[PDB]
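Page header: ASSEMBLY MODEL / two components / 482 residues total.
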Amino acid sequence: CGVPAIQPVLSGLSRIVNGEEAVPGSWPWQVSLQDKTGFHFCGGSLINENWVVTAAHCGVTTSDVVVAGEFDQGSSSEKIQKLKIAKVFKNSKYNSLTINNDITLLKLSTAASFSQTVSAVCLPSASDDFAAGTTCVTTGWGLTRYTPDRLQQASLPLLSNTNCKKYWGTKIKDAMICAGASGVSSCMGDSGGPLVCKKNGAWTLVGIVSWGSSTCSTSTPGVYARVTALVNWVQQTLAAN
Amino acid sequence: CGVPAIQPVLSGLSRIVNGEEAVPGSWPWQVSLQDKTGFHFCGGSLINENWVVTAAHCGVTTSDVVVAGEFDQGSSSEKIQKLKIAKVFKNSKYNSLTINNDITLLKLSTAASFSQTVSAVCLPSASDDFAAGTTCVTTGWGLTRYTPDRLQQASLPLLSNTNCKKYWGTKIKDAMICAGASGVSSCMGDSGGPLVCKKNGAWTLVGIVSWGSSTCSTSTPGVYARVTALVNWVQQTLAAN
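Prediction written out in full:
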């Protein structure tokens, strides 16, 4: 996990404004969630061939579809996999008002076929420490909500929850982690999309997109579900299902 | 339906600022949705003894609870009914990005006991016309998200979808209706709470709270699911279940 066959290329432009276009296929766990009519409404991350992790506030249902291996949403020429969803597992501690414990697992009806452009992100262990100041990366098509149709990426630093509260106040709970406010927007991340940090040569999922600045401010950090706080629930869910 | 045993009292103060406190029990279809720990996160409306209608973006589950007959959330002295949810019916056309077709039905495990303070709102027919300019009412505890712990009410006018788009642009779809921008906030309405209009001596559910001004502006209208566009789905759901 966490080692793309097509290596990401992150330049200085990933650190400012609205980030930059990713190398096609270089974020191979990134999926698009689409409705039964083909409309893209959320992102997510493959954690193996049968499971996608996303945000609970996406409200995914079994009639939505997981699209893997995509780079250009406006293209009909590239190879993609449209994967039906068999069952949706929402974390029971999710709260649609505070948006805390904002994590949902999707079990696919048929496994994805992993390839150079389709593979899994690594999960952290519950006791992993991703220190404030660590540079991490968010990816997605989030800018299309407001524009490039190809997958974008941005590099941005983790904040302590104390410092994040200077921006978002009592909205920040223990099961959340914030990133950004360093001169780049977090808006390229779709709801439910990944925030990954590279430790020990592998990209690890540290956050799942919950919300960000309503104006995509380069000085307001994004807010993410804190995966280390929820990974024990993820592993219990996989083991029981 | 739509005829409270305790008649509402709506004064001039319901038309300005953040509205006014309701007469206790005078909005008897109004319910509170709470999590398994007792935390209030959404509103809804009883449409009979076994069914509550709310917003799909509330993400209600069968472990949440419907609380009927409540006036003061900070009180343990008033009579209430905590009603378990047997099954949740989300409109399949709901879209968590555009928030269109934002309606969900809750079927209770055991019927509510209707009384002076607990009874049903009326539903419109699909072809009913609630003209722009009609004065309607929204109720709820929405102000507690930001403060009075008792149920509030505000009177505000319906807008045409054309005029609503001057405020919210292409966010406004046919299955939405807007109300307000007349000197009063819409923020007293909880997510999923009612917008009712009185035609022929009965209060009819015209809207369900979807979103409003992020700053509770008195000059920005609230956006609601348009019940006339969704009532055929409601009736099919009740008849099949």
